[PDB]
Protein backbone atom coordinates (compact mmCIF):
# COMPACT_ATOMS: atom_id res chain seq x y z
CA UNK A 1 0.00 0.00 0.00
CA UNK A 2 1.29 3.37 -1.02
CA UNK A 3 0.21 5.77 1.74
CA UNK A 4 -0.12 9.52 1.23
CA UNK A 5 0.32 11.91 4.13
CA UNK A 6 -2.73 14.10 3.89
CA UNK A 7 -4.40 11.99 6.61
CA UNK A 8 -2.71 10.36 9.67
CA UNK A 9 -1.28 7.01 8.44
CA UNK A 10 -3.21 4.61 10.67
CA UNK A 11 -3.24 0.89 10.11
CA UNK A 12 -4.95 -2.07 11.79
CA UNK A 13 -2.69 -4.30 13.88
CA UNK A 14 -3.50 -7.62 15.57
CA UNK A 15 -1.35 -7.90 18.70
CA UNK A 16 -1.92 -10.43 21.48
CA UNK A 17 -5.30 -11.59 20.23
CA UNK A 18 -6.77 -8.05 20.20
CA UNK A 19 -7.32 -5.62 17.33
CA UNK A 20 -5.95 -2.09 17.31
CA UNK A 21 -5.31 0.88 15.07
CA UNK A 22 -1.73 2.16 15.12
CA UNK A 23 0.12 5.08 13.60
CA UNK A 24 2.99 4.39 11.18
CA UNK A 25 5.78 6.50 12.63
CA UNK A 26 9.20 6.91 10.89
CA UNK A 27 10.34 9.24 13.75
CA UNK A 28 9.84 6.46 16.29
CA UNK A 29 12.86 4.16 16.74
CA UNK A 30 10.62 1.74 18.65
CA UNK A 31 7.08 0.48 18.83
CA UNK A 32 5.01 1.78 21.65
CA UNK A 33 1.39 0.95 22.40
CA UNK A 34 -1.05 2.28 24.99
CA UNK A 35 -1.52 0.12 28.09
CA UNK A 36 -2.84 -3.32 27.20
CA UNK A 37 -2.61 -6.89 28.28
CA UNK A 38 0.18 -8.95 26.92
CA UNK A 39 1.12 -12.36 28.28
CA UNK A 40 4.82 -12.65 29.19
CA UNK A 41 7.67 -11.27 31.28
CA UNK A 42 8.70 -7.67 30.62
CA UNK A 43 11.51 -5.36 31.75
CA UNK A 44 11.16 -1.72 32.92
CA UNK A 45 12.44 1.00 30.61
CA UNK A 46 12.14 4.64 29.64
CA UNK A 47 11.98 6.37 26.30
CA UNK A 48 12.27 10.00 25.31
CA UNK A 49 9.66 11.79 23.21
CA UNK A 50 8.96 15.45 22.56
CA UNK A 51 7.30 16.37 25.88
CA UNK A 52 9.83 14.46 28.02
CA UNK A 53 10.28 10.85 29.12
CA UNK A 54 7.88 8.00 29.82
CA UNK A 55 8.57 4.78 31.78
CA UNK A 56 7.42 1.77 29.72
CA UNK A 57 7.98 -2.04 29.91
CA UNK A 58 9.50 -3.98 27.11
CA UNK A 59 8.31 -7.35 25.86
CA UNK A 60 10.50 -8.99 23.19
CA UNK A 61 9.45 -11.58 20.58
CA UNK A 62 5.84 -10.41 20.51
CA UNK A 63 4.04 -11.51 17.39
CA UNK A 64 2.39 -8.62 15.60
CA UNK A 65 0.33 -8.59 12.46
CA UNK A 66 0.40 -5.17 10.81
CA UNK A 67 -2.13 -4.73 8.13
CA UNK A 68 -2.16 -8.48 7.31
CA UNK A 69 1.67 -8.66 7.37
CA UNK A 70 3.40 -10.66 10.15
CA UNK A 71 6.27 -9.25 12.21
CA UNK A 72 7.90 -10.33 15.51
CA UNK A 73 9.97 -8.02 17.73
CA UNK A 74 9.96 -5.85 20.84
CA UNK A 75 6.93 -3.74 21.72
CA UNK A 76 6.94 -0.97 24.41
CA UNK A 77 3.74 -0.69 26.46
CA UNK A 78 3.26 2.48 28.54
CA UNK A 79 1.47 5.79 28.48
CA UNK A 80 1.95 7.00 24.90
CA UNK A 81 -0.96 9.12 23.61
CA UNK A 82 -1.34 6.85 20.53
CA UNK A 83 -0.19 3.40 19.38
CA UNK A 84 3.11 3.89 17.53
CA UNK A 85 4.66 1.43 14.99
CA UNK A 86 8.36 2.50 14.87
CA UNK A 87 11.29 1.56 12.67
CA UNK A 88 12.11 -1.61 14.60
CA UNK A 89 8.95 -3.13 13.00
CA UNK A 90 8.63 -0.86 9.93
CA UNK A 91 11.71 -2.53 8.44
CA UNK A 92 10.14 -6.00 8.88
CA UNK A 93 6.99 -5.26 6.81
CA UNK A 94 9.39 -3.70 4.27
CA UNK A 95 8.30 -0.09 4.53
CA UNK A 96 10.04 2.82 2.92
CA UNK A 97 9.79 6.57 2.40
CA UNK A 98 9.57 7.81 -1.16
CA UNK A 99 9.41 11.28 -2.63
CA UNK B 100 14.54 9.46 -3.20
CA UNK B 101 13.60 6.11 -1.73
CA UNK B 102 14.51 6.13 1.94
CA UNK B 103 14.76 2.80 3.82
CA UNK B 104 14.25 2.76 7.60
CA UNK B 105 17.27 0.81 8.97
CA UNK B 106 18.70 4.21 9.92
CA UNK B 107 16.84 7.42 11.06
CA UNK B 108 15.43 9.09 7.87
CA UNK B 109 17.49 12.27 8.24
CA UNK B 110 17.53 15.01 5.76
CA UNK B 111 19.27 18.24 5.02
CA UNK B 112 17.13 21.36 5.09
CA UNK B 113 17.95 25.01 4.49
CA UNK B 114 15.77 27.33 6.53
CA UNK B 115 16.32 31.02 7.15
CA UNK B 116 19.91 31.34 5.74
CA UNK B 117 20.84 28.27 7.82
CA UNK B 118 21.69 24.66 7.17
CA UNK B 119 20.08 22.05 9.44
CA UNK B 120 19.43 18.29 9.52
CA UNK B 121 15.91 17.06 10.22
CA UNK B 122 14.13 13.71 10.58
CA UNK B 123 11.23 12.82 8.28
CA UNK B 124 8.56 12.06 10.88
CA UNK B 125 5.29 10.61 9.58
CA UNK B 126 3.92 10.56 13.15
CA UNK B 127 4.29 14.36 13.44
CA UNK B 128 1.31 16.39 12.11
CA UNK B 129 3.56 19.46 12.40
CA UNK B 130 7.17 20.61 11.80
CA UNK B 131 9.04 21.33 15.03
CA UNK B 132 12.53 22.65 14.80
CA UNK B 133 15.08 23.13 17.46
CA UNK B 134 15.14 26.65 18.91
CA UNK B 135 16.72 28.90 16.29
CA UNK B 136 16.93 32.39 14.79
CA UNK B 137 13.91 33.31 12.68
CA UNK B 138 12.57 36.64 11.37
CA UNK B 139 8.94 37.64 11.89
CA UNK B 140 6.13 37.57 14.35
CA UNK B 141 4.80 34.30 15.75
CA UNK B 142 2.23 33.26 18.29
CA UNK B 143 2.48 31.05 21.39
CA UNK B 144 1.23 27.53 20.59
CA UNK B 145 1.52 24.28 22.60
CA UNK B 146 1.80 20.77 21.16
CA UNK B 147 1.92 17.30 22.65
CA UNK B 148 3.85 14.09 22.22
CA UNK B 149 5.21 11.09 24.23
CA UNK B 150 6.46 12.76 27.51
CA UNK B 151 3.70 15.44 27.33
CA UNK B 152 3.33 19.07 26.20
CA UNK B 153 5.67 21.74 24.91
CA UNK B 154 5.19 25.46 24.41
CA UNK B 155 6.58 26.34 21.00
CA UNK B 156 6.38 29.51 18.95
CA UNK B 157 4.56 29.26 15.63
CA UNK B 158 5.68 30.84 12.31
CA UNK B 159 3.46 30.75 9.22
CA UNK B 160 4.69 31.07 5.68
CA UNK B 161 8.34 30.23 6.17
CA UNK B 162 10.23 28.86 3.12
CA UNK B 163 12.21 25.67 3.80
CA UNK B 164 14.23 23.57 1.25
CA UNK B 165 13.94 19.90 2.22
CA UNK B 166 16.36 17.53 0.44
CA UNK B 167 16.51 20.27 -2.25
CA UNK B 168 12.70 20.67 -2.72
CA UNK B 169 11.08 23.94 -1.63
CA UNK B 170 7.88 24.29 0.36
CA UNK B 171 6.34 27.19 2.35
CA UNK B 172 4.42 26.35 5.56
CA UNK B 173 4.08 26.87 9.32
CA UNK B 174 7.22 26.02 11.24
CA UNK B 175 7.05 25.69 15.02
CA UNK B 176 10.28 26.63 16.89
CA UNK B 177 10.80 25.34 20.44
CA UNK B 178 12.17 22.91 23.01
CA UNK B 179 12.12 19.64 20.91
CA UNK B 180 14.93 17.05 21.09
CA UNK B 181 15.35 16.84 17.30
CA UNK B 182 14.28 18.81 14.25
CA UNK B 183 11.10 17.11 12.83
CA UNK B 184 9.60 17.71 9.32
CA UNK B 185 5.95 16.47 9.86
CA UNK B 186 2.88 15.89 7.72
CA UNK B 187 2.21 19.59 7.00
CA UNK B 188 5.45 19.88 4.87
CA UNK B 189 5.86 16.18 3.80
CA UNK B 190 2.69 16.25 1.67
CA UNK B 191 4.13 19.38 -0.01
CA UNK B 192 7.33 17.65 -1.20
CA UNK B 193 5.24 14.69 -2.45
CA UNK B 194 6.34 12.15 0.26
CA UNK B 195 4.57 8.73 0.51
CA UNK B 196 4.87 5.61 2.66
CA UNK B 197 5.36 2.28 0.89
CA UNK B 198 5.06 -1.30 1.96
Ligand SMILES: *[C]([C]C([N])=O)[C](C(=O)[N][C]([C][C][C][N]C([N])=[N])C([N])=O)N(*)(*)(*)C(*)(*)(=O(*)*)C(*)(*)([C@](*)(*)C(*)(*)(*)(O(*)*)[C@@](*)([N@](*)(*)C(*)(*)(*)(*)([C](*)*)=O(*)*)C(*)(*)(*)C1(*)(*)[C][C][C][C]C1(*)(*)*)C(*)(*)(*)(*)([C](*)*)[C](*)*
Pocket residue numbers: 023025026027028029030047048049050081082084122124126127128129130131145146147148149180181183185
Ligand atom coordinates in the same frame (compact mmCIF):
# COMPACT_ATOMS: atom_id res chain seq x y z
C1 LIG C 1 4.62 15.82 16.82
C2 LIG C 1 4.53 17.29 17.23
C3 LIG C 1 3.57 18.08 16.35
N1 LIG C 1 2.93 19.12 16.85
O1 LIG C 1 3.38 17.73 15.19
C4 LIG C 1 3.66 14.93 17.60
C5 LIG C 1 2.21 15.29 17.28
O2 LIG C 1 1.77 15.16 16.13
N2 LIG C 1 1.53 15.73 18.32
C6 LIG C 1 0.12 16.13 18.26
C7 LIG C 1 -0.68 15.35 19.31
C8 LIG C 1 -2.10 15.00 18.85
C9 LIG C 1 -2.40 13.50 18.93
N3 LIG C 1 -3.25 13.14 20.07
C10 LIG C 1 -4.14 12.14 20.05
N4 LIG C 1 -4.24 11.32 18.99
N5 LIG C 1 -4.99 11.87 21.05
C11 LIG C 1 -0.02 17.63 18.54
N6 LIG C 1 -0.99 18.35 17.97
O3 LIG C 1 0.77 18.21 19.29
N7 LIG C 1 3.90 13.52 17.26
C12 LIG C 1 4.37 12.67 18.14
O4 LIG C 1 4.66 12.95 19.31
C13 LIG C 1 4.55 11.25 17.61
C14 LIG C 1 5.96 10.76 17.96
C15 LIG C 1 7.20 11.41 17.32
O5 LIG C 1 7.39 10.75 16.08
C16 LIG C 1 8.51 11.36 18.15
N8 LIG C 1 8.85 9.99 18.60
C17 LIG C 1 9.01 9.63 19.86
C18 LIG C 1 9.48 8.18 20.00
O6 LIG C 1 8.79 10.31 20.88
C19 LIG C 1 9.65 11.86 17.23
C20 LIG C 1 10.97 11.93 18.02
C21 LIG C 1 11.07 13.19 18.89
C22 LIG C 1 12.42 13.23 19.64
C23 LIG C 1 13.59 13.14 18.66
C24 LIG C 1 13.47 11.88 17.79
C25 LIG C 1 12.14 11.87 17.03
C26 LIG C 1 3.47 10.37 18.24
C27 LIG C 1 2.12 10.46 17.51
C28 LIG C 1 3.17 10.74 19.69
